Amino acid sequence: TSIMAVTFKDGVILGADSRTTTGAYIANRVTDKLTRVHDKIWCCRSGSAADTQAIADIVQYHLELYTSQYGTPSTETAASVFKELCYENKDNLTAGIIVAGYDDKNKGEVYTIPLGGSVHKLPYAIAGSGSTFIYGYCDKNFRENMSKEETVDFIKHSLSQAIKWDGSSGGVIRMVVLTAAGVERLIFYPDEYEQL
């Protein structure tokens, strides 16, 4: 996997490749690693497919029960529920999760949760095996308060390079846009992003 989430002026955008791996065999070339845990709180999944799915399902359940009692949860709250599961079960989990959501008060927010189950609030986050190859690129190119089109290009160019060098990443580039306007899904095919 190669995944990332980037805050910008109007909110936050999540990005991911579509490759699932089983050794050197691609078990699924059209995977959806961007996952809804609430209307406008989503997550990027990396690591074990089974572990991250099981965690995401439990979080979605917790936030649905939260919403029934206390109304819309904050993005911080969602990240805290992810953390609790990842931290307390650190011995039995292989899950690198980026949590991203849109509040109207707090706007776009990104929390990354690495293997140990620590939480890190950042302007943008990158994760997955393919992220290693774009630390240099992303650090040099990220700016705060970018536009929607700029942020889409930033993610597209970043994941394009991650996919190019990482054998464990590939397929299509999926993206999910989180703003006050709503939820938009974007897809970008090899013929476009490869020749960037």
Binding site: T1, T20, T21, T22, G47, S48, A49, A50
Partner: peptide, 4 residues
């Protein structure tokens, strides 16, 4: 097992 499937990885991402």
């Amino acid at each position: 097992a499937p990885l991402x």
